[PDB]
Design a binder for this molecule. Sequence first.
Ligand SMILES: O=C(O)C(F)(F)C(F)(F)C(F)(F)C(F)(F)C(F)(F)C(F)(F)C(F)(F)F
Ligand SMILES: O=C(O)C(F)(F)C(F)(F)C(F)(F)C(F)(F)C(F)(F)C(F)(F)C(F)(F)F
Ligand SMILES: O=C(O)C(F)(F)C(F)(F)C(F)(F)C(F)(F)C(F)(F)C(F)(F)C(F)(F)F
Length: 246
Amino acid sequence: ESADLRALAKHLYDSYIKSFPLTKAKARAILTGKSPFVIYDMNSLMMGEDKIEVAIRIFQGCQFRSVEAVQEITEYAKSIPGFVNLDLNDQVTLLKYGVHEIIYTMLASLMNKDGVLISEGQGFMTREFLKSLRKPFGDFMEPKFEFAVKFNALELDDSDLAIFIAVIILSGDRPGLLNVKPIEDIQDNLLQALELQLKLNHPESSQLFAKLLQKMTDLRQIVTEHVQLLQVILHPLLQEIYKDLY
Ligand SMILES: O=C(O)C(F)(F)C(F)(F)C(F)(F)C(F)(F)C(F)(F)C(F)(F)C(F)(F)F
Ligand SMILES: O=C(O)C(F)(F)C(F)(F)C(F)(F)C(F)(F)C(F)(F)C(F)(F)C(F)(F)F
Ligand SMILES: O=C(O)C(F)(F)C(F)(F)C(F)(F)C(F)(F)C(F)(F)C(F)(F)C(F)(F)F
């Protein structure tokens, strides 16, 4: 069992490395100096557009990048053992209600308190420049930075995140699922793999597993806040997902 749980953890990490171009390990090395173009004002944004309405151009740009993120997450989900054996309507339902929770978890790997890496680490857009965008675009990334600073304090690595992301995807309580029991059976196995992984990898963080379970609830609140903010404000694929999260 435990040996199988370590094998499951390794399989997920290997697929995680392949499905996502910029891992947290590489992101933190770029963020700490171990090089991206810094966008900190209107002048550097225009310079960076040449090197790599303004508020609408930014929002539409990340709208396309989020759709590409959905593609990467879908590729990773299909590598989770047992996922492709689920009914295709359940695979689509799990992805539709979970991709944004995954996007914000992985986005945290690209952020610090000062800004976020963009374009596969080629750029770095500051948190305060994003806040300077006209309303309502100036508050569109702020809740994500707030979550990331606290989430990053847990100091998870890529091997932890690969299992954590799989746990979120295999949520048996998404609306419209046909066969809840096989999804819950996979998640329980993933949850045991995650608990074993955190115990081995974080010998000085005794309550890390419990804190991560609470983060999964926080992510649902971030998504709810995000779709409400988007109701006040569009890519046709995202509208398909948003129509069911409103
Ligand atoms: O290309 C990417 O993957 C990206 F850089 F992440 C982005 F999604 F395009 C972006 F984050 F929205 C971006 F970088 F901000 C931007 F390119 F859209 C922009 F804002 F710089 C511009 F003005 F080009 F749209
Ligand atoms: O680093 C980037 O290139 C990026 F665009 F910021 C992103 F990380 F890909 C991103 F997470 F997809 C995002 F665009 F920031 C976003 F998806 F979080 C969003 F802000 F667009 C959404 F609207 F989805 F929250
Ligand atoms: O609108 C539909 O009829 C649809 F096919 F269900 C869908 F909305 F496109 C969707 F499949 F849910 C989806 F949003 F595109 C999806 F995200 F689930 C996905 F299947 F396309 C992806 F693969 F991206 F997860």
